[PDB]
């Protein structure tokens, strides 16, 4: 049996700037049980039709997870630009996989403001496909040296989403699992 049940129900989920990935092999996939669940609100499949998934079997599969806002769910797709798909996580233009996204206004809806999930704001160049950078050195905005001191023209290169219990539908948190098939 596959470990799918573990990634879809784990008690902890990483933020988007340090997204974890898992590799799964030697299991019997059961896309069926997830082919009818109504919990998922955005079950998009790119490259391969979702119905024929069960018949064919592959060698190696990868699963990645993020917690993202309501608006940026559409940005997890090939050939898209924005504040998230270009500096934090980008997909190859020849993507062949699935992007499951569901609502998490119960587990992750902190009371009084969470301020624990952060996304990357400032950088210097775009991101190659499947590129992760956990480093958090101080970013500079001018020729003046910054020597690791926060201040004018010296900004921390992260921002904290503000998830709350009464936010609108467009800003409520969503959890995304992207499956990539080699």
């Amino acid at each position: 049996l596959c470990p799918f049940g573990e990634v879809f129900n784990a008690t902890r989920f990483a933020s988007v700037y340090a997204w974890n990935r898992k590799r799964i092999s030697n299991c019997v996939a059961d896309y069926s049980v997830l082919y009818n669940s109504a919990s998922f609100s955005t079950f998009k499949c790119y490259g391969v039709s979702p119905t024929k998934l069960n018949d064919l079997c592959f060698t190696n599969v990868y699963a990645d997870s993020f917690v993202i806002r309501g608006d940026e769910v559409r940005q997890i797709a090939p050939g898209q630009t924005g504040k998230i798909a270009d500096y934090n996580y980008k997909l190859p233009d020849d993507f062949t996989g699935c992007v499951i996204a569901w609502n998490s206004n119960n587990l992750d809806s902190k009371v009084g403001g969470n301020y624990n999930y952060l996304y990357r704001l400032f950088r210097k160049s775009n991101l190659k496909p499947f590129e992760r950078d956990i480093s958090t050195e101080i970013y500079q905005a001018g020729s003046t040296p910054c020597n690791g001191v926060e201040g004018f023209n010296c900004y921390f290169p992260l921002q904290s989403y503000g998830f709350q219990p009464t936010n609108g539908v467009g800003y409520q948190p969503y959890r995304v699992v992207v499956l990539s098939f080699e």
Partner: antibody
Amino acid sequence: QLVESGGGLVQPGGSLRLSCAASEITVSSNYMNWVRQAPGKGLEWVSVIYPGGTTYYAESVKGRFAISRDNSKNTLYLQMNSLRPEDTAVYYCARVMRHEIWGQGTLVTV
Amino acid sequence: IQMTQSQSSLSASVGDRVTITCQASQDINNFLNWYQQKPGKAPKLLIYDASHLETGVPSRFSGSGSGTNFTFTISSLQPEDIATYYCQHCDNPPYTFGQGTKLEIR
């Protein structure tokens, strides 16, 4: 600080290259905004360029102007192509998303 | 998203408290900026994210509101504060400005 230049009159259908010169600020590392204003009317958005090179234009003026950056002189350039009579307005060059500083301003008329 | 200012001109005396309302269609959670523009000058940012105050402006200026309606409050009016104020949506492109409100002293 910033500075604009190239303001004046141009015959309908022409083109121009407005220059925004920046000092103390590296143009290759911040979000940049280009905002226009009609004479006596309210502000309207025109263009934005991201640090990574992505660029967004306004919905009503899409496909006629082009913004670019030059690191050798540290400048921002905007090239308008295929103008019209109502295109006349005062444009500006500003920094966004941390510590907004708005430059003095140029005038472009038909 | 169509930001709107129902009012267009409010007058008061020196030392009075003045409020300005800016409404937004659909919903913007906490994304709005208050811009001030003096006659014949370049506009300067006053309040970002509708609750945090910028450095340099006196503390007597304040902002509040959320969801659909936002408000800008001046506690003590000053003789040299005649200007035009705008509210701008600044979450994700495009960024649509408002109509503007002109303050008059008497």
